[PDB]
């Protein structure tokens, strides 16, 4: 069965770990420690092909990581996560996309833009602004809620579909 | 009064004074957040040796595990906190403890490239050949990463 090395990137507190745990464990976490960088795995069925997900949930980017750099060189898809209530996280997408382009040495890498915490009533980051950025990058944009599971499978599924292409 | 939260925070932040005081007023060394981190997990993860010891000496559970099955030893290995790994063992940490994926501390250290910790775990009776629930072992991880120095340790 096929293995996909997925990298989850984005600013601290956007809900990367909360997304990873909702996908693999089917449970929401409030409080998950913000510097634990682990790679969780998950067997799924995507479009009739049993396949294995090997997801790195980046944390602690402040400090250096041997295994994080190795995941970045080798990784196959990227989830670029921002929070819909954090304008700084949206701005940081620019730096993450550019960093991926440089480590991978390629204008075209499998990527999905994720606007997390869409379960939330107040929203500082407009749907059009996010859709325009994804449309300028030529990549899908998916709204997600790690709390309600909305769009969570879709985000990880679409990325696997983008690697197949 | 919720001194469990006040103790966890203190353990993470490396405030050995606040930890001493908090326990003196009967704060529970096996408090845990909504994902099962004990003060020991946090101290280990964040590299706080004096705090790790004072927690253990005060009866903290060394083989406590979070809701993904990780012991404090797992986390100490994860980060490459060598002197902590040793004292966790000296106080009875299970070397071959397996998280929800079946990974032992050897897998995690091997995977991060923490070779000094791999050497020490093996010396305390780590099982070189244990498979996680997807079949992988330390040696699978060395080949999967092209890590030459690790694959060497795992033979001669
Ligand atoms: N309402 C809501 N809260 C979330 C969501 N995702 C994460 N959070 C919360 O935001 C905090 C940060 O999540 P975390 O996974 O630590 O993000 P990370 O720091 O990127 O790994 C936690 O308290 C989560 O409960 C979401 O989709 N909706
Ligand atoms: Mg996190």
Numbering used by the authors:
A (entry chain A): 1 to 165
B (entry chain B): 22 to 177
Original authors' sentences:
Wild-type Ras GTPases cycle between an active, guanosine 5′-triphosphate (GTP)-bound state and an inactive, guanosine 5′-diphosphate (GDP)-bound state1234. The P-loop (residues G10-S17) is responsible for phosphate binding, whereas the Switch I (D30-D38) and Switch II regions (G60-E76) are critical for interactions with guanosine nucleotide exchange factors and effector proteins. To increase understanding of the effects of non-covalent inhibition of nucleotide exchange on multiple isoforms and mutant forms of Ras, we have isolated a pan-reactive antibody mimetic, Designed Ankyrin Repeat Protein (DARPin) K27, which potently inhibits nucleotide exchange, and also a comparator, DARPin K55, which inhibits the Ras/Raf interaction.
DARPin K27 bound strongly to K-Ras wt in the GDP form with a dissociation constant of 3.9 nM. DARPin K27 binds to the inactive GDP-bound conformation of K-Ras G12V burying most of switch 1 and leaving most of switch 2 exposed in the inactive conformation. The binding site of DARPin K27 overlaps that of the GEF, Sos. However, in contrast to the Ras/Sos complex, the binding of K27 leaves both the switch 1 loop and the bound GDP in near-identical conformational states to the non-liganded, GDP-bound Ras, whereas Sos binding distorts switch 1, breaks the network of nucleotide contacts and favours nucleotide dissociation. An overlay of the K27/Ras G12V complex with the non-liganded structures of Ras G12V in the active conformation suggests that the active, GTP-bound state is not readily compatible with K27 binding. In particular, the phenylalanine in DARPin K27 at position 56 would appear to clash with the main chain of active Ras in the switch 1 region (inset), whereas the switch 1 regions of non-liganded inactive Ras and K27 bound inactive Ras show near identical main chain conformations. Although it may be possible, through an induced fit, for active Ras to accommodate K27, the structural data support a strong preference for K27 binding the inactive form, in agreement with the biochemical data, which would enable it to sequester Ras within the cell in its inactive conformation. DARPin K27 binds preferentially to the inactive GDP form, with an epitope close to the switch regions in their inactive conformation. DARPin K27 however shows novel properties for a non-covalent protein inhibitor of Ras, since it binds preferentially to inactive Ras and acts by nucleotide exchange inhibition, thus providing a new tool for investigating this mechanism of action. The crystal structure of DARPin K27 in complex with Ras was used to design a non-binding variant of DARPin K27, lacking the ability to bind Ras, by alanine replacement of three interface residues to make K27 Null3.
